[model samples]
Target: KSITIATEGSYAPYNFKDAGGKLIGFDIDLGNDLCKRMNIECKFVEQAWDGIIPSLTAGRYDAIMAAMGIQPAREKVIAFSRPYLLTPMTFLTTADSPLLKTQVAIENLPLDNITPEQKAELDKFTKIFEGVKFGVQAGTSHEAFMKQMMPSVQISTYDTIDNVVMDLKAGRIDASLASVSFLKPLTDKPDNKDLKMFGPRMTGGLFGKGVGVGIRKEDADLKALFDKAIDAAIADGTVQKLSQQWFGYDASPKQ
Candidate 1:
């Protein structure tokens, strides 16, 4: 049987269209590999990020292989395969931003379990970011994080991260928050030469448990198939190799 997978073809390093408009990237490669392992033919269809989940629940696609984080709220509506990649969230800003000069005592903060010291750090960051103009892709955990943690910050939501980056370069927003996997490649581009990632890398909590295949909650069998395939891919180092090739680093989820 053939399964149709949905992806947002705008998020680079994870999934995006190449020069010839062919869908490509880490998610495409990994999804193809998983499909092969499951002995199923797979077709990838590009979908807008905002309605990705809604489309899935509406039966527009059999599964979603986008770089979608598996958050608690999302899990309430959908099922996720075990995480295939674990990436932390960070802020992308211009080189001259004062945020770069801010001393971040904790470089990596996992909000799943917060320590008193980490809470202090979070509070400090919240105060530092107060009233700052931030941009984030609409309907994403990044937007939710800003609204929940730093309510004082002025947030501008865009339909795509590309738009957010554009506004950032135009000085319309102070910074944009996104996954390190997306921001690292973004900042490396010549067009975004002055862009840089600043502030603490965040995970867990609002950020969720890394990227996973999004499936309808009732599709337990499909979820099982994806989990098994992902397990094998991780076991044989395929995930690591592909991640390094696409992301310039290993984003494979730790066993």
Candidate 2:
């Protein structure tokens, strides 16, 4: 292994500071597992989100162990070794907000089936949110998707997904969007009891596929090592272990 794994510590549950102020979370544990399986010395580097991928591209690290979703746009920049987890991005809003019942009445629907009626409803939502604010992590798909779908709503990007959710629970932000898996545990927490999911799940077009380890496409050796290690992890139940630890269910994304 003998690798330098880089991660953005700002992303919660995936990798961030806990209450006691410890650097621990899903990505940290998964990195440890990877190094153990690869059987070499491994170290973690905490990098800012803006520069994490750029750092990788510049060869500052051997690989990135962040929860980076495998999107087509990212693929043009770097290669990935399969996926660790895949989950839909969902919206989070206040439970008592106007979108509460209205959002639920829309039902369990997918983004692909948006009819004229559904499109009008989304337009109405955008109108209501015109003056209000919505939050997402800067440079993420959530912001891009929002800007494209709800052109009327005011959108601002934070530095991290965890920070965006924190603002939502703190009443500093009216609504937020992020991975449903990451939001569920956070919402169930005592402080976020009033938080609820709204709108339909979004995927495919902009959200991209699952999340996985990131490495430079030209680094074939490292990519091969990661690919092999990832296959072993998936085959022998390491992914399942980490999945249950962070997500409370087996949701490992397959190759």
Candidate 3:
């Protein structure tokens, strides 16, 4: 398992920097564990999310172990291994925000398929989200989905999800969108006590299937190796163990 992986060091609880700037989080631990199971030595490099794929294609690394999802647009550019984690997008707002009183019970609700009544419900939400600024990670599905779903809202994009959270806490943005898994632990922290999970839990549509390793299209064999290792990890409870420890829920894809 001699491999070099690239990750965004700003995605906290998934991957992020310590006060000493050490790269760590669930992705780092998961990559190391998968490498151990595959019996390959693995090294990780920190990279910005925007250029992670371009850098990979440029041969800057052997693979991308970031919390990158398996989306169709990405698949056309690079190959992905079997998904390691399946997660949903969720809204985060300050506890005192009036939007908290609104009912939003979407669990895995697909935006592409909805009844007229359901459509109307979403329209209502768009109005509620109106005049509110939403912070989303630039170049992410959260940004894409937020635009499509809440077009009336003022949208602001950031280079990283952590930046979105920071702005949200500062009242610079009325709400933020990201994976519930990434938001939950962060909101639970004492500094983020004023923040709370809000709105519907969303999946599918622009969010893609789930998180997977990104590899060069030419490295099909390497992708296959990762697929096997990931499958093994899932079968033996490694993924669930790591996922629960970091995300506070079982984020594994449905078998």
Which candidate comes out best when scored by lDDT? 1
Scored by TM-score, the top model is: 1
| Candidate 2 stretches greater than 4 Å from native | 18-22, 91-178, 198-205
**lDDT per residue (tens digit) for residues 1-255 in model 3:** 378999999887889988998889899999999888778998989998889999999998999988898888898899999889877778899998998898765544555577676677678778888878888899988888777777788898899888888898788999888888778878888988899997666666787778999999999888888889999899988898998887887777654
Off by over 4 Å in 1: 1-4, 8-11, 18-22, 36-62, 69-78, 96-98, 101-108, 130-140, 151-176, 216-218
Between candidates 1 and 2, name the one with more favorable TM-score. Answer: 1
Residue 246 in model 2: lDDT:
79
Q: Give the alpha carbon lDDT tens digit for every residue of 121-147 in model 1.
A: 888878877767888999998999888
The alpha-carbon lDDT assigned to residue 247 of candidate 1 equals 80
Q: Return model 3's CA RMSD, one decimal.
A: 4.6
- How much RMSD separates candidate 1 from the native structure? 4.4
TM-score of each: 0.69, 0.63, 0.68
* lDDT computed for candidate 3: 0.84
Q: Give the TM-score (vs. native) of candidate 1.
A: 0.69
